């Protein structure tokens, strides 16, 4: 909290966003990720101490924390459509349990509270978001966990939502440690939404975390792309180099272009297509397959990029580098 877990320099490399996909990445790449990512819902604390699987991969923060004891923990917290009731205090015991549990892991924790704050589908009110960020920031201090938990305000940076509407969601610089964004199909509006989020973070003097990232609508194993965000029709064959150059190269270039502020990313490395929420016939959008290990060229290029010196990977000095 209050900036102590923001690295002075470098970009935290983390992976997500379910236990099994993270394990598959770690095994396939022969690496311990520097950060690992799961989700919990505030209403039930689903996924905190036992399995939760709502079709977007299995979440189990206890299992994940035990499997990656010397990695940073990144946790998205959904309001489950109830941010106003959360702001009114109906989930305060759950908030304390969440914060106390995460602090008990004695490691850097990056907490994406009410993540995708401005995604209309989340049913948030601006007041509920602003109030609950203030509450959680202050409660972290009251519980004595300010050295352990860093509070991320993550926007959706989603092209179909009009730009210019971020201010209403902002709780104040006193209450936020990072601005976060989602990097999926930013090319659909010429990077306008992700650039707006970056510029907002920059203006506020906050570091930027790319909290959700994936080559959305691409399939790594199949080597295809679809222009259809709903159902992935009319798939087009791509070479592996094309897939790299179309999505991966501009993703890493975005970090470089925003190197004054970018201090972390979570790459979602998963066969989305195999997870029932994201599966055929695609009732909640078309996602694809983002496993870098599913193509030799993608895997090699991924490994080569993240090995570079601007990136913070796993080592014995990781926690110190992250301010822990
Ligand atoms: Mg912090």
CATH for 241: 3.20.20.80
Query: Strand locations in the chain, DSSP E?
Result: 11-16, 35-41, 52-53, 58-59, 72-78, 109-113, 149-154, 178-183, 208-213, 218-219, 224-225, 236-237, 262-268, 288-289, 311-312
Number of domains composing the chain: 1
Tokens of 238: 């791509």
User: Contact, 132 vs 83, CB < 8 A?
Assistant: yes
Instruction: Report how far ligand 1's centroid is from the alpha carbon of 236 (Å).
Output: 43
Give the ranges where the chain is alpha helix by DSSP (H): 19-29, 61-67, 83-87, 92-103, 126-142, 192-204, 240-243, 249-257, 296-306, 318-321
Instruction: Report how far ligand 1's centroid is from the alpha carbon of 202 (Å).
Output: 16
Print the domain residue range for 89.
1-324
Instruction: Report how far ligand 1's centroid is from the alpha carbon of 93 (Å).
Output: 23
Name the 3-class secondary structure at 73.
strand
Which member of 8, 174, 212, 320 is catalytic? 212
Residue 53 burial (CB count, 10 A): 17
Instruction: Report how far ligand 1's centroid is from the alpha carbon of 1 (Å).
Output: 3
User: Contact, 14 vs 35, CB < 8 A?
Assistant: yes
Instruction: Report how far ligand 1's centroid is from the alpha carbon of 149 (Å).
Output: 7
Any catalytic annotation for residue 305? no
Final resolution, Å: 0.9
Instruction: Report how far ligand 1's centroid is from the alpha carbon of 37 (Å).
Output: 17
Any catalytic annotation for residue 8? no
Residues at Cβ < 5 Å from ligand 1 ion: 4-5, 150, 177
Which member of 116, 174, 246, 305 is catalytic? 116
Question: What are phi and psi for residue 218, nearest 5 degrees?
Answer: -100, 150
* Experimental method, per PDB record: X-ray
Residue 68 burial (CB count, 10 A): 22
């Amino acid at each position: 909290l209050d900036g102590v877990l923001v690295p002075e320099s470098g970009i935290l490399v983390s992976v997500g966003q379910d236990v099994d996909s993270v394990n598959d990445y770690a095994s396939a790449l022969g690496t311990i990720p520097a950060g690992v990512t799961n989700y919990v819902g505030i209403v039930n604390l689903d996924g905190l101490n036992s399995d939760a699987d709502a079709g977007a991969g299995r979440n189990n923060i206890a299992e994940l924390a035990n499997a990656y004891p010397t990695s940073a923990l990144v946790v998205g917290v959904s309001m489950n459509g109830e941010v106003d009731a959360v702001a009114s205090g109906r989930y305060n015991a759950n908030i304390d349990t969440l914060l106390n549990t995460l602090a008990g892991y004695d490691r850097p924790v990056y907490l994406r509270w009410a993540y995708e704050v401005d995604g209309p589908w989340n049913g948030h009110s601006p007041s509920g978001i602003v109030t609950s960020f203030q509450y959680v920031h202050d409660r972290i201090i009251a519980l004595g966990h300010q050295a352990k938990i860093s509070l991320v305000w993550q926007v959706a940076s989603y092209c179909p939502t009009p730009g210019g509407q971020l201010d209403q969601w902002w709780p104040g610089s006193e209450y936020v440690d990072w601005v976060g964004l989602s990097y999926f199909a930013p090319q659909d509006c010429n990077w306008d939404r992700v650039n707006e989020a970056a510029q907002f973070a920059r203006s506020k003097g906050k570091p930027l975390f790319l909290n959700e990232s994936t080559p959305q609508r691409y399939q790594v194993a199949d080597l295809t792309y679809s222009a259809d965000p709903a159902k992935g029709t009319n798939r087009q064959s791509k070479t592996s180099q094309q897939l790299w150059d179309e999505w991966f190269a501009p993703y890493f270039q975005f970090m470089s272009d925003n190197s004054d502020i970018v201090k972390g990313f979570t790459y979602i490395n998963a066969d989305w297509d195999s997870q029932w929420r994201w599966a055929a016939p695609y009732n909640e959008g078309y996602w694809g397959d983002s496993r870098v290990q599913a193509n030799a060229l993608i895997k090699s290029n991924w490994q080569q990029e993240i090995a570079k010196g601007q990136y913070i990977n796993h080592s014995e000095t990781l926690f110190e580098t992250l301010g822990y």
